[PDB]
């Protein structure tokens, strides 16, 4: 197998994650899709680190994991705050700000 396949998979995964953010109203599923995007980035970083014979890409993947966890937690806090008032976790429900 040619190693570049790993990148294509990432390109697919990221793409799928992006599409998910567009297609799913649930905020939690949106968080899952953002996690998919960040992990596709991590896969690309790991593949390139292997390609260049150094671990820097792996370190970046680790830091991206940290960032993904923190962003997920912040999004969960925001969604808790919204849900406690609106009793809904749909992104489309936050439609007041428009035009």
């Amino acid at each position: 197998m040619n190693p570049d396949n790993y990148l294509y998979l990432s390109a697919l995964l990221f793409t799928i994650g992006a599409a998910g953010v567009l297609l799913r109203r649930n905020a939690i599923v949106m968080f899952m899709c953002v996690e998919l995007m960040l992990n596709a980035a991590n896969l690309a970083f790991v593949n390139f680190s292997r390609m260049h014979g150094q671990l820097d890409g792996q370190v970046v993947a680790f830091f991206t994991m940290v960032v993904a966890a923190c962003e997920v937690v912040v999004g969960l806090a925001i969604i808790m705050a919204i849900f406690r008032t609106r009793r809904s976790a749909s992104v489309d429900d936050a439609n007041l700000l428009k035009h």
């Binding site: 953010v21 992104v91 035009h99």
Partner: peptide, 17 residues
């Protein structure tokens, strides 16, 4: 153009994509 500001986060995400 203001009609483009639909107010849906997912439409904005589509514009970003």
């Amino acid at each position: 153009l203001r009609q483009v500001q639909t107010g849906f986060a997912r439409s904005y995400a589509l514009s970003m994509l």
